[PDB]
């Protein structure tokens, strides 16, 4: 059973930072890239960046370059994202999601994590 598990919430002080975790299972972790998406109520979904776990190569959304750092631990099958200098606008639900891309067309996300509610206050 393919699964991406995250922890339900994080409460953080403004100006501080957090390391969100996302544990994978049910598949060869290094075989697929890992994506991170941000969802604010009413705003919708926003893509933060992705990382290939096999070599650690990252690609970021210009908007989050310098706010989010992605890493992974191929030993424990966990992917990570650190968010720094948080402010009220950073409050949201953060998802890690997997992308397949075969067929000759889109990287269509096929598996999403349970999501982590982060609150800055």
């Amino acid at each position: 059973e393919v699964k991406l598990e995250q922890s339900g919430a994080e409460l953080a002080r403004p100006g501080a930072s957090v390391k969100l975790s996302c544990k994978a299972s049910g598949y060869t972790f290094a075989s697929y890239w890992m994506q991170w998406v941000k969802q604010r109520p009413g705003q919708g979904l926003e893509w933060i960046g992705a990382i290939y776990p096999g070599d650690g190569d990252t690609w970021y959304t210009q908007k989050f370059k310098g706010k989010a750092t992605l890493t992974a631990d191929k030993s424990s099958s966990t992917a990570y994202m650190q968010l720094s200098s948080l402010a009220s606008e950073d409050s949201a639900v953060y998802y890690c999601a997997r992308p397949p891309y075969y067929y000759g067309t889109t990287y269509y996300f096929d598996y999403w994590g349970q999501g982590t509610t982060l609150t800055v206050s």
Binding site: Q35, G44, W47, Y101, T106, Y108
Partner: peptide, 14 residues
């Protein structure tokens, strides 16, 4: 939601 998954940024509609 629709989404481009052509290239990075992957982005989504509203």
């Amino acid at each position: 939601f629709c989404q481009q998954h052509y290239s990075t940024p992957l982005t989504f509609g509203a």
